[PDB]
Each structure stands twice: as structure tokens, then as C-alpha cells.
């Protein structure tokens, strides 16, 4: 008995192909090139996934120190005084608190000032 490769390779390749959308030119059209693109695509996917958390870390900091500097502190000073109060484990996403809510971050700045001198 003999089992040809019939109807197998094709389904496989279409599965590969289908991931490809805004993929430019032969990347979205020819198989081998597509699949191959999806190797490096693997790399960037996973690695930059672990990375995105570094990225948002960066963003929020970049905001918080901004509000801080606006009110007379800075990130070093503000977070120092915050931690210096066992009070605020506030920490995470405090950025938006500084962005949307002016008087709140004014109270946090004043408070963190108390916890310094």
C-alpha cells in the first residue's frame, strides 16, 4: 500500500499562510517566504512580549516624575518620600493618578514632603 502526500501539505501551508496579513509582497503570498517570516516573527513576538512590561514600566515612571517635577519634587525625591512613609505601597500605575487628578498628586507630593523633612 502507498500513501501519497495528497491533501496534507496543502492544509499545512494554508495554515501557515493564513497568519500573514499586512505582510508585504511575497511574505503574505508565497509559502516558504511566509513561514520563514514567521520564524523571526516568533522571535519578536515572544521577546517583545516579555519587553512590553519594561516599556510600560518606563512610561509610568516617565509620567510620575513629570507630575513630581511639576510640583517641586522629582521621581527620586517623590518615591523616596513615598516609601519613607510605610503608608504608600501605591507604586503601580500611580502615573494616571498624577495625570488625571491634580490635587490628589498635590496631596501625595505634600505628604511625601512630610516624610522627608
Amino acid at each position: 500500500p502507498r500513501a501519497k502526500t495528497g491533501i496534507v501539505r496543502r492544509r499545512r501551508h494554508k495554515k501557515v499562510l493564513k497568519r500573514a496579513k499586512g505582510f508585504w509582497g511575497s511574505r503574505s503570498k508565497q509559502y516558504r517566504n511566509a513561514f520563514q517570516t514567521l520564524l523571526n516573527a516568533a522571535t519578536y513576538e515572544y521577546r517583545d512580549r516579555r519587553n512590553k512590561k519594561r516599556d510600560f514600566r518606563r512610561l509610568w515612571i516617565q509620567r510620575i516624575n513629570a507630575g513630581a517635577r511639576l510640583h517641586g519634587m522629582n521621581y527620586s525625591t517623590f518615591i523616596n518620600g513615598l516609601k519613607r512613609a510605610n503608608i504608600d505601597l501605591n507604586r503601580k500605575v500611580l502615573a494616571d493618578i498624577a495625570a488625571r487628578e491634580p490635587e490628589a498628586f498635590k496631596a501625595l507630593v505634600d505628604a511625601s514632603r512630610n516624610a522627608r523633612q
Binding site: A85, N86, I87, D88, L89, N90, E101, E103, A104, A107, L108, A111
Partner: peptide
């Protein structure tokens, strides 16, 4: 309550 008070 329009009164913002921090931790602890």
C-alpha cells in the same frame, strides 16, 4: 466624597 486621603 471629593476628599482624597492617602494610605494607612
Amino acid at each position: 466624597g471629593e476628599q482624597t486621603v492617602f494610605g494607612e
